[PDB]
């Protein structure tokens, strides 16, 4: 369930801005970050989930390159997005934004598994 949260603070990556990308980041690469715990969340699935699909979908996100860098680097400082926002700032963030809430999109797909995995439980 806590992992699902991290994964909730995503939602907020598909309302992603230009200058919250540069300072966002920072903070959405923080602790609790959004964008970090949005890799977090993901990473939570591929071994929080008890469905390989779960996995399968949470680790090609993981695996997947979010703005032309991977999704692991959307998600932590000091990594290759980073460097990718130093160059596009107000396309990135139109791009980049369309491309993360596409991203999120994916992860519900992943995300609900989860939940439904969780959910048989009861």
């Given at each position: 369930p806590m992992t699902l949260k991290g994964l909730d603070k995503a939602s907020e990556l598909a309302t992603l801005t230009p200058e919250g990308l540069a300072r966002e980041h920072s903070r959405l690469a923080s602790g609790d970050g959004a964008l970090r715990s949005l890799s977090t969340a993901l990473a939570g699935i591929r071994a929080?989930?008890?469905v390989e699909e779960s996995r399968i979908q949470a680790g090609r996100l993981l695996e997947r390159s979010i703005g032309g860098i991977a999704l692991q680097q959307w998600?932590?400082?000091?990594?290759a997005a980073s460097q990718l926002v130093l160059d596009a700032s107000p396309e990135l963030r139109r791009e980049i934004t369309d491309q993360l809430h596409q991203v999120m999109s994916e992860v519900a797909l992943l995300r609900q598994a989860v939940e439904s995995e969780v959910s048989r439980v009861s």
């Open positions: 929080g989930s008890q998600g932590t400082t000091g990594g």
